[PDB]
């Protein structure tokens, strides 16, 4: 759908009012299916590795998050439609310039292609960016055709600050999701009992990201 209208008339007001925005049927069945095949090819060729945490301590990462992931730039052979998804996400964000809170969004991470391989895997309650590493917006695309959350689980539960209800997001095929990455939106991925795929991109605030890079380049 046209990026300008979607961004300014739905995403921006929804994010500023609620900090969470769901766009269903983002790319259509055909494109969503091609993305799914590309993700399943990465899975089938051994590209995924255990999901990792910002700060690693005595504990195992699998006690925290049970997914396996790979990072995709978008230009790799066999990832062309993932690149199209990424470009489509970027297009929406560019049309939001200066309208999402006070942030100045000039960059993003690579795409995290993520798989919870059933077996009850999930992600304990967490904040995506609790310590100011530059991430301001989390963007997720789901590609689980035939997902029945009542049996297979995998619901993303967000606890938006200051709300009388939490937000339950089923990992529905062709669903696009935005939410603030900071402490306003603690969230958890509830156990998945079937193979669950998503693609995650984080968008950076320029000023916060610059401060985070300074801290990294000077030894914290």
């Amino acid at each position: 759908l046209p990026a300008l209208k979607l961004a300014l008339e739905y995403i921006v007001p929804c994010m500023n009012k609620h900090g969470i925005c769901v766009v269903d049927d983002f790319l259509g069945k055909e494109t969503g299916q091609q993305i799914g095949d590309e993700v399943r090819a990465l899975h089938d060729t051994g590209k995924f590795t255990d999901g990792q945490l910002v700060s690693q301590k005595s504990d195992s990462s699998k006690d925290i998050r049970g997914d396996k992931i790979t990072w995709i730039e978008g230009k790799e052979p066999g990832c062309e439609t993932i690149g199209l998804l990424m470009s489509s996400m970027d297009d929406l964000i560019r049309h939001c310039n200066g309208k999402l809170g006070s942030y100045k969004i000039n960059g993003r991470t690579k795409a995290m292609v993520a798989c919870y391989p059933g077996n009850g895997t999930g992600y304990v309650r967490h904040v995506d960016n609790p310590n100011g590493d530059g991430r301001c917006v989390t963007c997720i695309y789901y590609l689980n055709k035939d997902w029945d959350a009542k049996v297979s689980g995998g619901i993303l539960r967000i606890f938006p600050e200051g709300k009388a209800q939490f937000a339950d997001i089923e990992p529905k095929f062709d669903r696009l999701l935005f939410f603030w990455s900071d402490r306003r939106n603690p969230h958890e991925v509830q156990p998945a009992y079937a193979t669950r795929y998503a693609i995650v991109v984080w968008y950076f605030d320029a000023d916060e990201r610059a401060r985070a890079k300074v801290k990294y380049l000077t030894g914290e």
């Binding site: 945490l53 990072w71 000039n106 960059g107 993003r108 995290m112 960016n129 991430r135 995650v200 890079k213």
Partner: peptide, 20 residues
Amino acid sequence: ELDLETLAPYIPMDGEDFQL
């Protein structure tokens, strides 16, 4: 309190930022 960075999903901190 808990150090929430021990639960936060990892991202590369240098050399992998995409410019829009």
